[PDB]
Amino acid sequence: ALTQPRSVSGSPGQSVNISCTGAYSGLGWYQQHPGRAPKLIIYEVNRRPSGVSDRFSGSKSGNTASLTISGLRTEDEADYFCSAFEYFGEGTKLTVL
Amino acid sequence: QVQLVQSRAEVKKPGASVKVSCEASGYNFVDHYIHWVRQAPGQRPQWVGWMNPQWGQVNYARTFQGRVTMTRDTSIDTAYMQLNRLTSGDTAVYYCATQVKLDSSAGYPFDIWGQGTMVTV
Amino acid sequence: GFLGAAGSTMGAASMTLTVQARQLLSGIVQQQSNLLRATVWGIKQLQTRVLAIERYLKDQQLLGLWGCSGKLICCTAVPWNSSWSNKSLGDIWDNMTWMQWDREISNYTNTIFRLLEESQNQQEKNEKDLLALD
Amino acid sequence: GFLGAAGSTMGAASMTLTVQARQLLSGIVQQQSNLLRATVWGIKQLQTRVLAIERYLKDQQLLGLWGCSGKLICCTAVPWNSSWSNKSLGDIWDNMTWMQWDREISNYTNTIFRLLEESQNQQEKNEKDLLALD
Amino acid sequence: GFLGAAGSTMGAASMTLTVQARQLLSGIVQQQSNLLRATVWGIKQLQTRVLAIERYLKDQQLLGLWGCSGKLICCTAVPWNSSWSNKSLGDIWDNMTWMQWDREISNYTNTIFRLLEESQNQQEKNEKDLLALD
Amino acid sequence: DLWVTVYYGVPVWKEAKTTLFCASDAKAYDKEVRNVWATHACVPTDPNPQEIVLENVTENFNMWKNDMVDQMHEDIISLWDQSLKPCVKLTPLCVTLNCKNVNGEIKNCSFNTTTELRDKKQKVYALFYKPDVVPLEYILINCNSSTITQACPKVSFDPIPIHYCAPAGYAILKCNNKTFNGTGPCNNVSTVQCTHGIKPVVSTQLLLNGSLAEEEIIVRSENLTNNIKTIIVHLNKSVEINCTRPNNNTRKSVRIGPGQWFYATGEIIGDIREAHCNISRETWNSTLIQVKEKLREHYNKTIKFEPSSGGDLEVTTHSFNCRGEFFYCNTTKLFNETKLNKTIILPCRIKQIINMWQEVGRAMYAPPIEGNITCKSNITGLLLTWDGGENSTEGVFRPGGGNMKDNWRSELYKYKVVEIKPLGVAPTKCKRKVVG
Amino acid sequence: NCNSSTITQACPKVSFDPIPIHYCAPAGYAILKCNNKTFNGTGPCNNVSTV
Amino acid sequence: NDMVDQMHEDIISLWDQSLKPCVKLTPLCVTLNCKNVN
Ligand SMILES: *[C@@H]1O[C@H](CO)[C@@H](O[C@@H]2O[C@H](CO)[C@@H](O[C@@H]3O[C@H](CO[C@H]4O[C@H](CO)[C@@H](O)[C@H](O)[C@@H]4O)[C@@H](O)[C@H](O[C@H]4O[C@H](CO)[C@@H](O)[C@H](O)[C@@H]4O)[C@@H]3O)[C@H](O)[C@H]2NC(C)=O)[C@H](O)[C@H]1NC(C)=O
Ligand SMILES: *[C@@H]1O[C@H](CO)[C@@H](O[C@@H]2O[C@H](CO)[C@@H](O)[C@H](O)[C@H]2NC(C)=O)[C@H](O)[C@H]1NC(C)=O
Ligand SMILES: *[C@@H]1O[C@H](CO)[C@@H](O[C@@H]2O[C@H](CO)[C@@H](O)[C@H](O)[C@H]2NC(C)=O)[C@H](O)[C@H]1NC(C)=O
Ligand SMILES: *[C@@H]1O[C@H](CO)[C@@H](O[C@@H]2O[C@H](CO)[C@@H](O)[C@H](O)[C@H]2NC(C)=O)[C@H](O)[C@H]1NC(C)=O
Ligand SMILES: *[C@@H]1O[C@H](CO)[C@@H](O[C@@H]2O[C@H](CO)[C@@H](O)[C@H](O)[C@H]2NC(C)=O)[C@H](O)[C@H]1NC(C)=O
Ligand SMILES: *[C@@H]1O[C@H](CO)[C@@H](O[C@@H]2O[C@H](CO)[C@@H](O)[C@H](O)[C@H]2NC(C)=O)[C@H](O)[C@H]1NC(C)=O
Ligand SMILES: *[C@@H]1O[C@H](CO)[C@@H](O[C@@H]2O[C@H](CO)[C@@H](O)[C@H](O)[C@H]2NC(C)=O)[C@H](O)[C@H]1NC(C)=O
Ligand SMILES: *[C@@H]1O[C@H](CO)[C@@H](O[C@@H]2O[C@H](CO)[C@@H](O)[C@H](O)[C@H]2NC(C)=O)[C@H](O)[C@H]1NC(C)=O
Ligand SMILES: *[C@@H]1O[C@H](CO)[C@@H](O)[C@H](O)[C@H]1NC(C)=O
Ligand SMILES: *[C@@H]1O[C@H](CO)[C@@H](O)[C@H](O)[C@H]1NC(C)=O
Ligand SMILES: *[C@@H]1O[C@H](CO)[C@@H](O)[C@H](O)[C@H]1NC(C)=O
Ligand SMILES: *[C@@H]1O[C@H](CO)[C@@H](O)[C@H](O)[C@H]1NC(C)=O
Ligand SMILES: *[C@@H]1O[C@H](CO)[C@@H](O)[C@H](O)[C@H]1NC(C)=O
Ligand SMILES: *[C@@H]1O[C@H](CO)[C@@H](O)[C@H](O)[C@H]1NC(C)=O
Ligand SMILES: *[C@@H]1O[C@H](CO)[C@@H](O)[C@H](O)[C@H]1NC(C)=O
Ligand SMILES: *[C@@H]1O[C@H](CO)[C@@H](O)[C@H](O)[C@H]1NC(C)=O
Ligand SMILES: *[C@@H]1O[C@H](CO)[C@@H](O)[C@H](O)[C@H]1NC(C)=O
């Protein structure tokens, strides 16, 4: 029961901002580059693992996980998955104009 | 260093069995749990189970119970996952996942993933 | 008993400080090695015994450099700078426990410990040397 | 020398108490590790050195909690309850040795040791804190 | 810092003696065992901590037997026999360092150390016992 | 004015870890080199433990971040290697076994060993269990992985209560809450000299020989709802198990070297009978029920059960030691039904070459015990793992014993090691006499 | 005794000549030496000396 | 006296410690072919 939208609009300099509702939603978020395995970008809704840029961050709510990325680039075009323990979200594709 | 390397991609017939290995190098293989997770090309990623290499202690989702068996070879730091009774709906890419370079002991989420093994039946 | 007044008020706890003072080192009433039998436990035990002396001797050393070696309660002449804590006498000694006091002033305790060694005992001894010169 | 006055009268023995006080720890004139060689003797030696410090630090700790840390002879204000010993001044200090004294009062020394820490130094310090308040 | 005034005059060096005093034992800020790992280094380390206690406890013991336990500077009432050194006050404290002093009087320090324990603290305590008798 | 006033001996502590110390009970009745946990240098404890109860204080606990359970697991491993250091190696026993069956679970195997003389060879027979032998015409189970050091028959594996005691200057804080988390604040804490009687048992899926609860059953995990960590179901009452090895085995001494004597199983006499355990039926029937009530408080629907899916033989079965012999009991009879004297009987198979802790190194060979074997399991806890992602209608709790620190966390949940900082600065209206 | 226990030969470098060794009590203890010329063992000693 | 128990334990311990790095005679336990000298 972990749902997220499929495509949200964006532009370089404008933030792309994703909702993900569910029970214990948004424990971890994955950035799946097209071709290889996903990579952890945030864990425990807000904390940042090593090896990722400072612009990757997330915010918490009551039941909706809000992943906010500021300062988009052309190389960030990837599929974003919201995860909750063993469950997973539908998947959100980046849109950069 | 501290990476997960999987086997080659395989395509099999329905009913046959496939073995997806995931060797680990550069870190303590025994101390960290090995999770296995799917991703169908056009569907949400589905979580299969986990396997810690101390005794094996395998855990399965009900949609794979009785079909998947995970064994190990801790002398060569290799984690296996064998699927039995393959069908048409068992097509995905199969990832081995773990948690090493994180400060969270809760076991979720995963940070280090394998190279990928696309299995189409 | 030991650490018995950890939840009591500072005034009540200050009366039985001798009980906590005895137990940092002894130690030798409970065992001496023990040489009645003559291993992992032997190396582990010895490192505990050395460590209990290391912590105990530091506190008497700090008390020594503050000129308070022989006493458990000593008064000084370094004034209390208000930036450390703004609380009054009745808000500290009759309403708070020692546990909650240590939590708030732990940031600047080190330079307070620097004030105890410099401001008084390093000045008092030079003045006391110049005082008994005649 | 060390334990030389063990058979003398208490008055004669009380003059040379410094000699027994010196040799309780040293120790470091006879050896330091020794780092001139670099075994059963090494483990045996080390456990003795820890024990010698640990026993020594107990006595200065007890003297410390009686407010007698710096002194070899200190007087108190705990009165001598007659149930402990009925002997007078001249029957103790000029006719008896220390060895036979320890034998007779050893039953209640722990309660006496309880009186030295509670009756005086725990009361004297609270009163002395209340005395220097003005 | 530690041993910073080793080349300064005795008057300048005597003001910062607390700095050199702190470092003989600690010790426990740098390590406690350490129990974060759980070898040649382990046995070597332990023999250092025991040695650091034992030498340190000698100095407080010597200061204790001279009745100077609590203080870093204490004055006595044993007079200075001129055979030890013939130098005056101004030839010592404002023109000489502590280093060259130790080299010249090290020969008779032992009978000086015998004078500090016998002449005063062994006489002062017997007199102080006879003084508080009334 | 307000001048500092330092107090020596203040009752304030800090969360810090140190090394503990064994202190067994005053039970030096040895008469032989025994007690591989106590060994030769674990001191007697205090005959009168000074338990000290505190008030007006609520200190937080964390039994999964506790460093005592890391230090306990390091000592029990260290005692396991230290007791096996002077014991007899089984290097010359790693030869080709000529094994024939008895009928069963025992094969008689005839092998070649050197005698005390380096040139003479003898051929002797020995009963070896089935899971101690891998096919090759046979060999031992792990002679081609690592060496085998058999257990010395003088020593004993009976776990005596050992008290882990913090050194002087430290303290152990014992929580007295009848219904307590595990991790979280405790309203009733008590400092003690050191711990109660802790039996260092080795057991999977079933916590044997420990402390019970007072009010009711407490279910414990890190946060329960996560499936990756085991759940420690600490029982209130104790069920009764009568485990046995009801066949007569004779101990045969095989000459393999000078002083090195290899004690194997000689001729079996009597009836070829399986080792079984009687875990009641009535006390266990009420037990799972009371387990259901506590598990239903943390969920909202039915809670079923199912035996272990896989792994090594030592986790799929119920492992323990029963008078120097290691059992492997099939606990499918316990957990099969889907929950919301006519005793149940567990087929247990015996292994001698056991590789405990799964560390690559010494894997001991437990020598056989002459005669019948009877012990007394007691159960003061359970080890369960939640299932994966499913529907909300029901959840499955497979039993499982993971890392051995889960066994010690059932007994070290109450305790916590803190250092005492007796130096404290607090302002008062007192000032010392001025110099001038 | 090859069928009872192993044999470890003495190293030819070392020597079995017994040199005088003094067993010494550590700091805080003492050794009481009895000086009676005809001394039985068990029983009181009239002339003792700490060493 | 406990000194004679401690001394006897040391001389045993010195006996085992000095023989610890010394040469084992394990391969010498073979069939010896012995003939007399006289
Ligand atoms: C959980 O706790 C229970 C306790 O309720 C444990 O059960 C006990 O386990 C111990 C140890 O395994 C048992 O003690 C052993 O009993 C053997 C049988 O005893 C009979 O035979 C002897 C000798 O003929 C009689 O004296 C006795 O009265 C009985 O008739 C003994 O043979 C054992 O002796 C050991 O020491 C002696 C002395 O050196 C040796 O000669 C022996 O060879 C042997 O090494 C030993 O005493 C005990 O019987 C069990 N039951 C009870 C009720 O206490 C569980 O084992 C424990 N669970 C776990 C997992 O540890
Ligand atoms: C995504 O990022 C910004 C900053 O987080 C969003 O701004 C607020 O986001 C919260 C939760 O994400 C909402 O509850 C507020 O209503 C938002 N405020 C405003 C003024 O929008 C913002 O929604 C997103 N940015 C975009 C879409 O550009
Ligand atoms: C289980 O662990 C998770 C973290 O992995 C906890 O989740 C957070 O808990 C805090 C407070 O309890 C919430 O504010 C957060 O929103 C939770 N989620 C995240 C993603 O941080 C959870 O609390 C734990 N469970 C229990 C019962 O304590
Ligand atoms: C706090 O815990 C202590 C220790 O468990 C309790 O003291 C014991 O209480 C029981 C009954 O509650 C008595 O039978 C014991 O005799 C008590 N122990 C001692 C040493 O006297 C105490 O009652 C608890 N207090 C609260 C408020 O929960
Ligand atoms: C173990 O296997 C051996 C195989 O040789 C059996 O030992 C011999 O059995 C014969 C009977 O067939 C006896 O006459 C011999 O005396 C036995 N040998 C010895 C050394 O005693 C033996 O029967 C088997 N053990 C079991 C329990 O079946
Ligand atoms: C396990 O064994 C114990 C004793 O060895 C049994 O307990 C006794 O059972 C008898 C009758 O069977 C009763 O008369 C006693 O009162 C019981 N004693 C105790 C202390 O309980 C127990 O019944 C056995 N359990 C099983 C399942 O076999
Ligand atoms: C434990 O025992 C149970 C039965 O009591 C075993 O489960 C089944 O047993 C039957 C025989 O009655 C076999 O035919 C089946 O293959 C077994 N498995 C299943 C899934 O039905 C179980 O295998 C035993 N476990 C162990 C480890 O011995
Ligand atoms: C008590 O014993 C001591 C030690 O044996 C005696 O002292 C030594 O013995 C002879 C005889 O007196 C002297 O020549 C030595 O010089 C003494 N040694 C020292 C260091 O003085 C002592 O004489 C004995 N006394 C009695 C009364 O028997
Ligand atoms: C705890 O609180 C009560 C009431 O606040 C008080 O009477 C008591 O002295 C306090 N301390 C202890 C140790 O009970
Ligand atoms: C034992 O050694 C002999 C060689 O003398 C060999 O013939 C025999 O088969 C060996 N035993 C086994 C069980 O292989
Ligand atoms: C040891 O032998 C077993 C027997 O089948 C085999 O499975 C295993 O791979 C071997 N291990 C090694 C390290 O050779
Ligand atoms: C632990 O148990 C206490 C009992 O009151 C509860 O408040 C707390 O939420 C529990 N914590 C977890 C993680 O279950
Ligand atoms: C277990 O308990 C249930 C209900 O309490 C009962 O129906 C059932 O018969 C019991 N089992 C046995 C074996 O009596
Ligand atoms: C569980 O096992 C018992 C004993 O073998 C059996 O009577 C019962 O029917 C089983 N329950 C289920 C749900 O299979
Ligand atoms: C075993 O359980 C019984 C329950 O009646 C208890 O009396 C006994 O003390 C337990 N044995 C041990 C060793 O804890
Ligand atoms: C060792 O060999 C000797 C040689 O005669 C023999 O007497 C003795 O019994 C043997 N020892 C054992 C334990 O067999
Ligand atoms: C030594 O070995 C030779 C052959 O290598 C053999 O003939 C002889 O019997 C052996 N034993 C002796 C000489 O005692």
Side-chain angles (χ1 to χ4, degrees), chain F residues 87-152:
Chain F
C87 278
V88 169
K89 294 259 181 306
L90 296 199
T91 301
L93 277 296
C94 297
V95 307
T96 61
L97 292 203
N98 203 24
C99 295
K100 316 295 207 175
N101 300 281
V102 294
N103 266 27
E105 215 74 24
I106 298 172
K107 298 176 183 290
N108 211 18
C109 300
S110 70
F111 41 81
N112 287 29
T113 72
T114 188
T115 61
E116 293 83 3
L117 275 75
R118 275 302 157 285
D119 45 356
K120 264 172 41 63
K121 274 203 181 283
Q122 65 182 177
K123 171 176 174 182
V124 298
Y125 78 98
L127 291 202
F128 286 129
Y129 284 100
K130 285 186 181 291
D132 283 7
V133 166
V134 287
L136 186 64
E137 66 268 15
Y138 280 172
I139 58 159
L140 287 182
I141 181 174
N142 51 4
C143 277
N144 73 277
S145 296
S146 76
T147 197
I148 293 168
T149 62
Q150 73 167 355
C152 292

Side-chain angles (χ1 to χ4, degrees), chain E residues 11-24:
Chain E
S14 67
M15 185 185 288
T16 184
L17 299 196
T18 55
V19 187
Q20 284 73 225
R22 214 173 314 101
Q23 205 68 253
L24 272 59

Side-chain angles (χ1 to χ4, degrees), chain F residues 307-308 313 316-317 328-333 345 347 349:
Chain F
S308 180
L313 183 63
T316 64
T317 61
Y328 288 113
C329 291
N330 182 13
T331 43
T332 306
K333 306 282 311 213
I345 300 168
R349 300 202 310 287

Side-chain angles (χ1 to χ4, degrees), chain F residues 215-379:
Chain F
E215 280 276 3
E216 60 184 7
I217 295 90
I218 297 89
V219 161
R220 294 189 171 99
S221 176
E222 261 166 0
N223 53 24
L224 191 43
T225 61
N226 204 3
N227 58 326
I228 192 66
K229 318 308 261 183
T230 69
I231 292 181
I232 309 176
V233 186
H234 186 102
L235 273 189
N236 189 359
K237 59 150 74 68
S238 68
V239 303
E240 188 68 29
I241 315 186
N242 290 318
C243 285
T244 178
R245 211 274 312 271
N247 83 77
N248 224 27
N249 271 328
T250 50
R251 165 191 279 187
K252 183 179 186 293
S253 170
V254 165
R255 305 289 94 184
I256 71 175
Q260 321 203 303
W261 305 340
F262 169 63
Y263 288 108
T265 298
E267 153 191 39
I268 188 166
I269 62 170
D271 303 321
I272 308 288
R273 287 186 52 215
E274 202 149 349
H276 48 82
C277 296
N278 309 84
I279 190 167
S280 75
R281 192 179 213 134
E282 284 285 288
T283 311
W284 189 247
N285 194 66
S286 296
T287 286
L288 297 180
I289 296 177
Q290 293 154 206
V291 164
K292 292 327 305 310
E293 208 188 359
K294 310 303 163 288
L295 278 178
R296 274 201 40 101
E297 281 191 18
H298 310 319
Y299 289 92
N300 285 313
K301 281 95 175 166
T302 179
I303 299 298
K304 70 161 295 180
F305 295 91
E306 193 144 340
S308 180
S309 64
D312 289 331
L313 183 63
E314 313 159 70
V315 170
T316 64
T317 61
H318 162 47
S319 179
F320 58 98
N321 47 359
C322 182
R323 193 183 175 182
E325 280 273 40
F326 294 98
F327 275 60
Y328 288 113
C329 291
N330 182 13
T331 43
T332 306
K333 306 282 311 213
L334 281 71
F335 322 111
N336 55 356
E337 200 270 346
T338 288
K339 295 287 295 296
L340 171 56
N341 214 358
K342 187 67 180 294
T343 63
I344 48 171
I345 300 168
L346 310 186
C348 312
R349 300 202 310 287
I350 316 291
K351 271 185 63 151
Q352 297 180 98
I353 298 170
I354 181 166
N355 44 4
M356 185 64 73
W357 330 112
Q358 204 58 256
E359 296 205 358
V360 178
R362 280 171 186 163
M364 62 153 54
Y365 168 76
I369 315 294
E370 200 155 26
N372 278 305
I373 287 162
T374 307
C375 57
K376 215 63 151 163
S377 308
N378 205 277
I379 296 192

Side-chain angles (χ1 to χ4, degrees), chain C residues 1-7 10 13-14 17 20 23-27 30-31 33-34 37-41 44-45 48 51-52 55-56 59-60 62-63 66-68 72-80 84 89 92-93 98-99 101-102 105 112-113 116 124 127-128 131, chain F residues 2-14 18-22 37-44 46 52-57 59 71 75 78-79 82 162 164 167-171 173 191 193 419-432 435-436:
Chain C
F2 182 76
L3 184 63
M10 273 162 157
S14 67
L17 299 196
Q20 284 73 225
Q23 206 70 250
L24 269 59
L25 183 134
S26 170
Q30 285 90 20
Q31 43 177 350
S33 172
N34 286 291
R37 297 158 309 274
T39 187
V40 59
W41 304 124
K44 184 188 291 207
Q45 170 175 0
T48 63
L51 185 60
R55 281 176 49 85
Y56 172 83
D59 287 345
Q60 293 292 111
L62 286 191
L63 269 185
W66 305 344
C68 299
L72 305 158
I73 298 169
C74 72
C75 300
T76 62
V78 62
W80 194 286
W84 302 339
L89 278 300
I92 285 175
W93 293 100
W98 278 98
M99 261 315 317
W101 175 251
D102 184 21
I105 65 168
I112 294 172
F113 279 17
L116 271 296
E124 86 192 21
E127 298 174 322
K128 274 163 191 172
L131 189 148
Chain F
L2 269 183
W3 320 81
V4 303
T5 297
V6 298
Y7 291 74
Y8 182 45
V10 291
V12 66
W13 67 79
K14 285 281 204 296
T18 187
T19 183
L20 273 296
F21 184 37
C22 181
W37 323 113
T39 61
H40 197 96
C42 173
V43 306
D46 206 319
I52 297 168
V53 58
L54 322 180
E55 269 94 0
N56 294 275
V57 63
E59 188 86 344
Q71 275 189 36
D75 290 337
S78 296
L79 292 159
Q82 181 208 304
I162 50 172
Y164 273 19
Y170 293 87
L173 297 182
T191 180
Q193 172 59 272
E419 69 180 4
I420 311 295
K421 289 199 181 153
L423 263 170
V425 178
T428 195
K429 302 178 179 179
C430 169
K431 174 187 70 155
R432 65 168 53 171
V435 182

Side-chain angles (χ1 to χ4, degrees), chain A residues 9 13-18 59 61 65-70:
Chain A
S9 177
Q14 191 272 330
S15 57
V16 164
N17 184 336
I18 298 89
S59 173
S61 85
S66 55
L67 164 77
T68 312
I69 173 171
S70 292

Side-chain angles (χ1 to χ4, degrees), chain H:
Chain H
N1 206 355
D2 286 299
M3 291 185 38
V4 311
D5 288 330
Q6 276 189 36
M7 177 169 189
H8 180 228
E9 200 46 58
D10 289 336
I11 303 295
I12 286 178
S13 296
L14 294 159
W15 195 275
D16 313 329
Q17 180 208 301
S18 292
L19 292 181
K20 199 160 283 184
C22 279
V23 169
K24 294 260 181 306
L25 297 197
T26 302
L28 277 296
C29 297
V30 306
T31 61
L32 323 177
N33 203 24
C34 307
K35 318 295 207 175
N36 299 281
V37 292
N38 265 27

